[PDB]
Amino acid sequence: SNAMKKEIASHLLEIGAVFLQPNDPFTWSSGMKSPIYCDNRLTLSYPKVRQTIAAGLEELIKEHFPTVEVIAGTATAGIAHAAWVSDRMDLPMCYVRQIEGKAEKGQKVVVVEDLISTGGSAITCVEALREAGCEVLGIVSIFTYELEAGKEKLEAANVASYSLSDYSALTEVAAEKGIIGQAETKKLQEWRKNPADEAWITA
Amino acid sequence: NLYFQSNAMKKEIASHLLEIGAVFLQPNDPFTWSSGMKSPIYCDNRLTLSYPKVRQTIAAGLEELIKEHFPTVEVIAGTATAGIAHAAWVSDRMDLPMCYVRSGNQIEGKAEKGQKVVVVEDLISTGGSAITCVEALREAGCEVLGIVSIFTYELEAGKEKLEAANVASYSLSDYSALTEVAAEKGIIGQAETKKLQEWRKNPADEAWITA
Numbered sequence: 001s002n003a004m005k006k007e008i009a010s011h012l013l014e015i016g017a018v019f020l021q022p023n024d025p026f027t028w029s030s031g032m033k034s035p036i037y038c039d040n041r042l043t044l045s046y047p048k049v050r051q052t053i054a055a056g057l058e059e060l061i062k063e064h065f066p067t068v069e070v071i072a073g074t075a076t077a078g079i080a081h082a083a084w085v086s087d088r089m090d091l092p093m094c095y096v097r098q099i100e101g102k103a104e105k106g107q108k109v110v111v112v113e114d115l116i117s118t119g120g121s122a123i124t125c126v127e128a129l130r131e132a133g134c135e136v137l138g139i140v141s142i143f144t145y146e147l148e149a150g151k152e153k154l155e156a157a158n159v160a161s162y163s164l165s166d167y168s169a170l171t172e173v174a175a176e177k178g179i180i181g182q183a184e185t186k187k188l189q190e191w192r193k194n195p196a197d198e199a200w201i202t203a
Numbered sequence: 204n205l206y207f208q209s210n211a212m213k214k215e216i217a218s219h220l221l222e223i224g225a226v227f228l229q230p231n232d233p234f235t236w237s238s239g240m241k242s243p244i245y246c247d248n249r250l251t252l253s254y255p256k257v258r259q260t261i262a263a264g265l266e267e268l269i270k271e272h273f274p275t276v277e278v279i280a281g282t283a284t285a286g287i288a289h290a291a292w293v294s295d296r297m298d299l300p301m302c303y304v305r306s307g308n309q310i311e312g313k314a315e316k317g318q319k320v321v322v323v324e325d326l327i328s329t330g331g332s333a334i335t336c337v338e339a340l341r342e343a344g345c346e347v348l349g350i351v352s353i354f355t356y357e358l359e360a361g362k363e364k365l366e367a368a369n370v371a372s373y374s375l376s377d378y379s380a381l382t383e384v385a386a387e388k389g390i391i392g393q394a395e396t397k398k399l400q401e402w403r404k405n406p407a408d409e410a411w412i413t414a
């Protein structure tokens with residue numbers, strides 16, 4: 001499965017959907033400094049890459065949530081991916097902003113997200129599905145930053161989450177290719193453990 | 204011949220929208236939109252997403268309109284949020300890049316200078332969303348070939364804006380075809396036909412209710 005995480009991570013680097021600048025930090029909209037930037041909306045503009053991703057998400061759904069009956073996407077980024085997955089699996093689709101498209105009582109649903117950072121969008125979306133009477137099998141996403149605050153929320157909501165690729169696999173990949181060195185690898189590992197703390201900047 | 208092909212498709216699609224509850228016609232029991240206005244028609248195309256056979260027929264349909272009217276297309280743009288899924292299906296059948304426009308950045312996904320773009324919408328009522336979305340694309344330096352949508356109410360105020368913006372718009376189905384279909388099924392008759400025609404000409408005016 002790590003082969004897949006590494007392949008997908010390579011694809012995100014290749015198209016500019018993920019970047020790594022531990023020595024020249026980004027500043028998210030939150031105001032927080034970060035060594036990573038991820039814009040998975042770019043995957044939409046690359047036909048071969050988005051089809052690989054959909055194939056990837058279909059595979060995760062079959063191994064972890066085989067009984068799925070309906071696919072739900074998160075407005076707005078993940079709607080397109082939910083569409084491609086639903087099509088490859090020949091399943092009904094719906095989306096959450098309320099809940100558009102049929103999502104009837106007791107149906108087994110899988111949520112498709114493009115990114116998990118804090119987990120707020122995923123949880124919000126899962127809540128609505130449960131509130132409408134759906135059994136949410138879990139979530140699949142393209143990528144996750146593996147932040148501890150994200151894991152904690154997913155646990156509090158009792159939601160299983162799997163991602164095509166993640167921060168550690170991207171990190172290992174970037175180092176294999178020489179995009180980053182040993183020093184930059186340590187700044188990256190420490191940012192993940194304490195993202196609120198600006199120590200990592202000079203680790 | 205072209206004309207029959209085109210209209211057979213408008214009727215098939217209209218029949219599918221009625222069957223799944225994506226459109227309703229009640230000239231003798233009017234709806235009230237969120238805007239406060241009374242209407243003989245209600246349309247929620249988001250329901251198409253829950254019907255795999257119907258949505259594929261729609262995507263095939265939109266691909267066909269794009270090939271006849273805008274063959275040189277290079278990128279597909281969907282309107283947040285309803286039309287993003289349809290844009291996704293169309294982009295895939297055509298193996299083309301995709302982007303979307305909101306109303307984060309306004310234009311998400313690559314939409315580079317000089318690229319020929321086609322916007323995909325699910326519904327055209329007043330034309331405001333479409334025009335907004337088209338303006339952004341032109342402002343970013345894209346050539347907007349035109350727009351394709353699943354359905355349109357054929358309102359005169361809508362046509363006028365699309366002309367002022369010099370945007371060609373084609374729809375998979377429309378009010379008139381739905382109207383002719385609804386009659387074929389007995390959902391309405393010839394008496395209600397006049398209420399429906401007048402609503403289309405002057406939707407703001409509640410004369411149609413008792414036409």
Ligand SMILES: O=P(O)(O)OC[C@H]1O[C@H](OP(=O)(O)OP(=O)(O)O)[C@H](O)[C@@H]1O
Pocket residue numbers: 074075076077078113114115116117118119120121122307
């Ligand atoms: O785990 P979180 O901290 O919620 O971050 C993840 C969210 O960020 C992006 O959406 P965003 O709402 O920024 O905009 P969008 O409308 O482009 O999806 C993405 O679609 C995720 O839903």
Ligand SMILES: O=P(O)(O)OC[C@H]1O[C@H](OP(=O)(O)OP(=O)(O)O)[C@H](O)[C@@H]1O
Pocket residue numbers: 282283284285286324325326327328329330331332333
């Ligand atoms: O031609 P117009 O008069 O703009 O109306 C057409 C639009 O109305 C709906 O907007 P809404 O924002 O309710 O839909 P959405 O958020 O579900 O995309 C829908 O998105 C259509 O694209």
